Amino acid sequence: SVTEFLKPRLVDIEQVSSTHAKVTLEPLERGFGHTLGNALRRILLSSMPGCAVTEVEIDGVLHEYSTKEGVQEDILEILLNLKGLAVRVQGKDEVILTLNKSGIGPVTAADITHDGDVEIVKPQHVICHLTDENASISMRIKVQRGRGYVPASTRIHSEEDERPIGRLLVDACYSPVERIAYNVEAARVEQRTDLDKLVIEMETNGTIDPEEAIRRAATILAEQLEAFVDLRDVRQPEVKEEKPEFDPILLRPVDDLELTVRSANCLKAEAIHYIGDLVQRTEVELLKTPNLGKKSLTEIKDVLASRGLSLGMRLENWPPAS
């Protein structure tokens, strides 16, 4: 009784506005008030799944340092405003929105071409100001989902992303929580005293729902705590590995090599679906195919062999797993 105390629960999701929200957890025995409050504040501020804009491309732009006859703000200000946009997506983990406007007016959020799953949170968010009469802005916006925050240059993966000069890279700053205050107070509970009703107030982007964010943060915290809820000598290092030598290409099919679909159906019609079983396909066992000229054979030799392998090798590792 005096030990093995009770446990809290979420009793209210009172939202004083569309953004400012308040939740009340109760009860907390003692000290758990400040403890849980600070811990949840840290978790919330740190990592909540956001969905801010990450990529844009406009027609007339060649670099974010340009201008565009007709729009009041410069391109860079449009980038900053876009970054300021707040949106939620539900099903997918990324989406490509489109915004087309023409004529004088303040181009705002709601004037984009929303899909069925994407949902703007506040319409009057000003994106730009079309001030010339027959000015036209048509832009595409890749909006993705992630965790935490990431700058622009740190997103570099290859050179094809920057290949289209129209690519503009806004630094994604998605974290639906903007400020998180909390405080405890004496809860006039059923029969006890000094049980602490904790109140958490959150100013957020209207992207995340209060109870949603609370339960997501609680799951994160409970899982990360579970890592040493039964801590031990789990220490990782090991040695003397025996690895399946075959390259993962062999598991993959032909279409995992960027080949012409004609040669794909050709090796279909010549008993080739895997890649570990087309290396078990002699060189005479390829050109017999219905209607191989050189082009389909070009793709074959290119994405099968010329990438490092042969057009059929007498190998004896496959199958080690199939």
Partner: protein
């Protein structure tokens, strides 16, 4: 006059507000001084040196 102005706002005259470390979660004693100071950035940024 600065005291009068702070008094116009709902902020304490002493220009000192208690805080709470985000690490510990507890408070500091000795109410710290917090305001809005102007801050520049000089063209001595590290990229030109390292």
């Amino acid at each position: 006059e600065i005291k009068e102005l702070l008094k116009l706002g709902d902020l304490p005259t002493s220009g000192q507000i208690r805080l709470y470390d985000g690490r510990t979660g507890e408070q500091f004693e000795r109410p710290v001084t917090v305001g809005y100071m102007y801050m520049l950035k000089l063209n001595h940024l590290v990229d030109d040196k390292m």
